């Protein structure tokens with residue numbers, strides 16, 4: 072069951088590269104593409120993400136996309152820059168100017184067919200393609216605008232495949248431009264309709280974690296991407312290593328998505344660590360379970376106590392007592408049963424994987440579908456409305472052919488999504 | 499790629515061009531003959547400084563610039579000056595008869611005779627571009643060429659280059675160095691005509707620059723040379739993001755996204771620091787916090803107005819030199835709890851920051867102290883409308899009596915163009931008033 076990976080825009084390519092860097096190390100693949108590991112667990116399902124090449128070389132099934140060559144040139148000169156298939160580098164020259172319209176309708180529409188040629192070339196090599204995963208931000212132009220354009224066209228050509236995304240949400244605390252709420256709202260509209268699974272990665276939460284918890288006075292994007300790569304590794308563990316639970320993208324979707332539009336997940340992770348800062352003390356299982364559920368460990372700036380969990384997927388990594396894990400997992404549900412919907416019996420599922428990530432002897436990754444996620448979309452909607460009520464900064468969009476009505480629809484659909492999440496919070 | 503083409507129109511535009519391009523050369527280590535030893539790619543390249551310089555096979559780095567004036571004596575000094583080898587003779591264009599402080603002559607009578615030749619020479623630069631970003635236009639509001647010919651050119655550029663971006667550096671008249679009583683007329687006419695065709699315009703109040711030279715550099719009677727060397731530093735700070743690369747470097751177009759909430763509202767206020775003499779800068783280091791706080795002293799603005807009695811729609815900080823984000827963030831946090839900084843209710847209050855590690859440079863024998871770090875704030879304030887208000891009032895005083903209007907009518911203009919232009923300015927003042935009102 073092969074997965075085709077796509078990374079779009081500056082953010083998309085910067086976390087996308089970091090992702091391939093991290094899991095390549097876990098699968099024992101060096102920058103050359105050669106395997107140098109000591110466990111056979113590493114190679115059993117390496118076909119999910121890697122293509123097998125001459126000399127038993129492994130090549131990521133990854134497609135790199137951008138409307139400017141800057142970031143992708145940095146990727147190609149980065150640590151694992153050479154592992155990527157050079158033909159899978161598809162880039163324009165004009166950029167998107169943090170403009171959704173440019174990415175979706177003009178600049179990106181010019182490039183999108185070239186990208187789909189590569190997607191198609193990769194897909195036909197697959198014995199049994201299960202689907203796609205996209206990494207991108209929603210606050211810019213390329214990843215947000217062209218990324219959702221790609222999603223729409225992939226769904227057209229592969230309507231029976233799963234679409235998955237890692238979507239970075241914009242935050243004023245970590246902001247490039249004022250129009251990020253516009254770009255994000257337009258994108259969420261697209262995501263609600265055309266993805267089955269979306270990991271909501273909030274730059275607000277990533278900032279707060281770095282500041283409040285990791286005590287980083289002034290966090291960079293590099294710091295923020297330490298958390299993202301750690302989270303991305305964890306939520307894909309069940310897909311990359313042998314196991315019985317949530318092993319493919321469809322079975323994850325069937326277990327996590329009770330209603331088709333409500334497919335926006337809160338990722339969580341424990342223990343939280345900063346770059347370089349060495350951890351010497353391994354956490355106990357009770358500690359991992361408590362932390363991975365705490366709001367301070369959520370990658371989406373939402374209070375889980377303000378909502379209810381529809382579904383939960385948990386993945387413990389390392390050498391530990393699987394009996395202690397099940398005990399602690401059952402304790403959380405039994406002590407805080409109110410925060411789990413009673414009309415989905417046994418909605419918490421747990422997996423365990425012997426291989427821990429690098430630098431930690433054990434870890435836990437959390438994937439929650441909570442109604443509390445509405446707080447994320449409400450926040451975006453408020454920032455959106457503040458500007459839109461005065462039609463501020465809209466000329467950037469009307470200049471590319473967009474009409475005000477399209478903003479109104481996007482606004483309305485996100486507010487509908489909010490109310491849908493609220494409907495089940497009071498069930 | 500991302501080439502930018504500079505167009506210097508009239509005496510003010512040209513002489514400011516001299517200051518800017520001299521300054522660029524020193525910043526990039528380019529010699530007066532155009533050679534650049536540090537540049538190992540001979541005859542071309544994709545480096546950041548190539549946005550402003552093209553390269554010949556002989557290793558000469560040539561400004562992507564055109565100089566235009568309807569009279570030859572100012573550009574002749576360039577043709578025979580220190581940097582004469584820098585420009586191809588075709589980049590330097592002159593007529594024989596200036597516009598005589600008359601917009602009509604600059605736009606119509608004299609200007610129409612040379613406009614086609616100018617567009618041809620501009621076209622020759624553009625075709626050498628692999629990815630032309632846009633134009634930077636330098637001109638005065640007061641001169642007949644600066645006002646009249648510029649507006650004609652901007653109109654023609656919109657036709658020949660569609661929606662390709664066009665930025666202005668406009669010299670706003672001051673009585674201390676004024677050359678004509680009719681500069682208010684020329685100012686209103688060119689502002690009205692260029693408004694639809696400019697994407698972003700940086701106004702430079704000559705009186706603001708004049709005062710800074712007097713107060714901060716102790717120059718008893720500033721010359722154009724004093725003013726231009728100061729102006730070129732602000733221009734350099736603004737274009738630095740295009741000419742240099744860096745991790746924390748933010749492109750001017752990204753700032754532009756924040757600075758222009760509506761098409762007509764495209765006049766950012768510039769504030770630069772530190773402006774200080776060698777005598778005072780000695781054994782005195784101005785920290786990040788100090789130069790940042792100086793950005794909110796109205797005495798340091800390129801345009802005379804009071805932002806403390808207005809509302810902000812954007813605030814951008816463009817640092818250069820020894821600066822790190824930590825110190826910037828600390829300085830900003832302090833400032834917000836001590837200054838009169840108030841935003842409109844429909845816009846976020848976060849300051850957008852850019853840093854170019856390349857330190858500030860000064861021209862030999864210049865009045866500015868060489869400092870380790872500088873900052874240019876670009877803000878969008880309703881207060882900048884005060885500059886329109888002062889100009890419009892002076893316009894009204896004369897036009898009520900139709901003083902000097904016959905000089906314009908004699909060159910083919912109609913009084914309807916004056917009234918149309920003034921009505922547009924009144925609408926513009928009202929626009930800046932409307933954006934400041936709280937939402938309902």
Ligand SMILES: Nc1nc2c(ncn2[C@@H]2O[C@H](COP(=O)(O)OP(=O)(O)OP(=O)(O)O)[C@@H](O)[C@H]2O)c(=O)[nH]1
Nearest residue numbers: 508509510596597598599638640641642643644722
């Ligand atoms: N800052 C600065 N302002 C200048 C300079 N030269 C002229 N000005 C201003 O420009 C205005 C006059 O316009 P000019 O540019 O000199 O005239 P012009 O553009 O050549 O148009 P003509 O009437 O045809 O000569 C006055 O307000 C001057 O103060 C200069 O070198 N530096």
Ligand SMILES: Nc1nc2c(ncn2[C@@H]2O[C@H](COP(=O)(O)OP(=O)(O)O)[C@@H](O)[C@H]2O)c(=O)[nH]1
Nearest residue numbers: 080081082085208210211212213214241245292
């Ligand atoms: N976490 C993270 N967020 C980023 C990064 N780069 C940009 N962003 C965020 O994404 C938005 C800007 O989008 P960007 O990816 O630069 O636009 P694009 O290149 O046109 O797709 C803003 O909300 C940024 O905070 C990054 O490296 N990491």
Ligand SMILES: [Ca+2]
Nearest residue numbers: 537539542543
């Ligand atoms: Ca070169």
Ligand SMILES: [Mg+2]
Nearest residue numbers: 081082211247
């Ligand atoms: Mg970006």
Ligand SMILES: [Mg+2]
Nearest residue numbers: 508509569596
């Ligand atoms: Mg002249």
